[PDB]
Amino acid sequence: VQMRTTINNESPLLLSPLYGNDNGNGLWWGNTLKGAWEAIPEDVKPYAAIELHPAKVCKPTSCIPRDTKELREWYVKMLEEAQSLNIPVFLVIMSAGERNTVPPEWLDEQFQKYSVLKGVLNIENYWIYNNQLAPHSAKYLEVCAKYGAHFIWHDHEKWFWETIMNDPTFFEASQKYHKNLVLATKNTPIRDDAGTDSIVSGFWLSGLCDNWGSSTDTWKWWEKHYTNTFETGRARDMRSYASEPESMIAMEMMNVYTGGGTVYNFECAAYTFMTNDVPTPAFTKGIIPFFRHAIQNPAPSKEEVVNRTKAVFWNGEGRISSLNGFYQGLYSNDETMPLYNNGRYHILPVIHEKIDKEKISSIFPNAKILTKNSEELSSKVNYLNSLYPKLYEGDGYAQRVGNSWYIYNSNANINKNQQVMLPMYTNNTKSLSLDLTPHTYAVVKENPNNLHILLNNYRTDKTAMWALSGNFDASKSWKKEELELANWISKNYSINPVDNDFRTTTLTLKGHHKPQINISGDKNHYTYTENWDENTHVYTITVNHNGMVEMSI
Numbered sequence: 001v002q003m004r005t006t007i008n009n010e011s012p013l014l015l016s017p018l019y020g021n022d023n024g025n026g027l028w029w030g031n032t033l034k035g036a037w038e039a040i041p042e043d044v045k046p047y048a049a050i051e052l053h054p055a056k057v058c059k060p061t062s063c064i065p066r067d068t069k070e071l072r073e074w075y076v077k078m079l080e081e082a083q084s085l086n087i088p089v090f091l092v093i094m095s096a097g098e099r100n101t102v103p104p105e106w107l108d109e110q111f112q113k114y115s116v117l118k119g120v121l122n123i124e125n126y127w128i129y130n131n132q133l134a135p136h137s138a139k140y141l142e143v144c145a146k147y148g149a150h151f152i153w154h155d156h157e158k159w160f161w162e163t164i165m166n167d168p169t170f171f172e173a174s175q176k177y178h179k180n181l182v183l184a185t186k187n188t189p190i191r192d193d194a195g196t197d198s199i200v201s202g203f204w205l206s207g208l209c210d211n212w213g214s215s216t217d218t219w220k221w222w223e224k225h226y227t228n229t230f231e232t233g234r235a236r237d238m239r240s241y242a243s244e245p246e247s248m249i250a251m252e253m254m255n256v257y258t259g260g261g262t263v264y265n266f267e268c269a270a271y272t273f274m275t276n277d278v279p280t281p282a283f284t285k286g287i288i289p290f291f292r293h294a295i296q297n298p299a300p301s302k303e304e305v306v307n308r309t310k311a312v313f314w315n316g317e318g319r320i321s322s323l324n325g326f327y328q329g330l331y332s333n334d335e336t337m338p339l340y341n342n343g344r345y346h347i348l349p350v351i352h353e354k355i356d357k358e359k360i361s362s363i364f365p366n367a368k369i370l371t372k373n374s375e376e377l378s379s380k381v382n383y384l385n386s387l388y389p390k391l392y393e394g395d396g397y398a399q400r401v402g403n404s405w406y407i408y409n410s411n412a413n414i415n416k417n418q419q420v421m422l423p424m425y426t427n428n429t430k431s432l433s434l435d436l437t438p439h440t441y442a443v444v445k446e447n448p449n450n451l452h453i454l455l456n457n458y459r460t461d462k463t464a465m466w467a468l469s470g471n472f473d474a475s476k477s478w479k480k481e482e483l484e485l486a487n488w489i490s491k492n493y494s495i496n497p498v499d500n501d502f503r504t505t506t507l508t509l510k511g512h513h514k515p516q517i518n519i520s521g522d523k524n525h526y527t528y529t530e531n532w533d534e535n536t537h538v539y540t541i542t543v544n545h546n547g548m549v550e551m552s553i
């Protein structure tokens with residue numbers, strides 16, 4: 001059967017969600033199916049689809065898709081709409097521990113009828129686990145395999161993913177139907193961010209799913225009790241899900257991309273996508289620019305990831321869920337948040353206990369297999385450092401990915417700059433340094449005879465939103481106050497974003513004739529000064545920006 005969606009490093013997938021309403025036109029946040037697909041740029045459309053989450057249509061609990069007459073009616077109403085407009089769609093059919101979800105035969109029927117139905121999602125179960133979730137998912141995966149569709153499972157936490165793949169039914173189904181399976185993170189619960197990336201990407205490396213990815217959830221900002229950027233001492237509310245810096249959304253995507261991931265999903269959509277059919281700056285100037293990077297520059301392939309891996313951690317003699325300080329001293333000081341401090345080790349893969357040690361040896365013949373009982377873990381950092389050489393100086397995040405450097409400031413909500421000094425692997429320049437403010441990322445690609453540099457620090461001032469009067473408590477999710485915030489967003493944030501405060505990124509090329517650069521960027525959102533020292537052959541460009549800047553040197 002032909003695959004309904006091609007998903008790989010050369011053809012990544014961007015998911016944008018719509019949510020059901022139990023009234024009106026049947027959709028929340030004032031959006032429509034037509035407006036959703038209208039929001040997706042024409043160059044991105046070949047690599048995109050719309051997620052349909054029944055949300056408020058679900059009864060007795062919103063977002064929990066218990067099979068009902070009304071639920072089916074809603075799926076069918078939306079499928080009819082999407083089919084008429086040739087909009088590729090995925091249905092959320094499992095969530096939050098629900099055991100009585102739509103029958104596999106019902107889904108089979110819908111695949112038969114609707115060419116636009118590309119697959120289904122299972123989302124979020126770590127707080128409400130039961131032993132039916134894995135076998136149910138396995139059955140739906142088999143249905144997906146029948147029709148060339150994809151089953152996408154977003155979930156989180158080390159113990160949880162360990163538990164899922166220990167299920168004999170789901171482990172078997174994964175071995176059979178890996179082509180049709182996507183396993184993905186969902187960093188909502190502000191725990192296990194590093195371990196989850198290692199285990200989920202490890203499933204992909206182990207051949208249990210052909211693609212992995214993420215649901216990047218700005219509700220994490222609410223979970224942390226964070227408010228306006230860098231602010232302390234204010235009570236959280238729904239405005240917190242609209243306050244994670246736009247460029248930081250893209251940095252979360254970069255963690256997936258550079259780990260070989262290929263599927264990107266997002267919450268909360270009132271911030272990350274659209275309200276009243278007006279796409280938001282988080283979407284247009286955060287998610288879209290990074291997704292375009294991923295379309296234009298294929299993520300590391302499975303074999304590239306395998307080949308760069310010097311060690312793996314195998315859960316076979318004790319599990320990563322039992323080593324809560326594992327990533328300390330290596331690359332994450334704080335698993336409650338997604339940003340990595342260090343790119344020296346990439347994402348270290350964690351291999352699941354159901355994969356035999358002989359198979360690991362076969363997949364990664366050149367990697368050390370660490371286990372919990374490895375004597376080398378008595379000096380964990382020194383040992384890993386003997387395998388992964390130090391590649392840069394400074395306190396910023398930098399990762400070497402083939403012929404490129406991937407860089408960001410790792411400070412999530414502390415207003416402090418970071419610096420990196422990056423040795424270079426061609427004689428275009430000897431070394432390249434960056435001074436980065438928070439919520440700035442960069443990508444430097446070394447071509448044979450030029451450097452391509454991408455800078456993006458886009459972050460709107462959230463102050464105006466935080467200054468509004470009213471009750472925006474999260475207990476009014478799915479209620480009129482949430483619409484009120486969404487209505488404000490479509491008339492203020494999305495049309496008159498407060499993005500005129502520029503921040504400075506300083507780029508220095510040491511040991512680089514005075515370059516004649518080609519520079520562009522977001523209209524009216526950057527200025528720059530250049531400096532050339534002909535004796536030292538040092539070129540400095542000082543870029544003041546709020547948004548994207550691109551150069552070829």
Ligand SMILES: C[C@@H]1O[C@@H](O[C@@H]2[C@@H](O)[C@@H](O)[C@@H](CO)O[C@H]2O)[C@@H](O)[C@H](O)[C@@H]1O
Binds near residue numbers: 053063188267
């Ligand atoms: C079960 C999930 O429900 C919704 O997500 C919830 C959010 O709306 C918010 O309350 C966060 C705070 O942690 O919790 C989530 O459960 C859906 O958006 C999601 O896709 C799941 O179906």
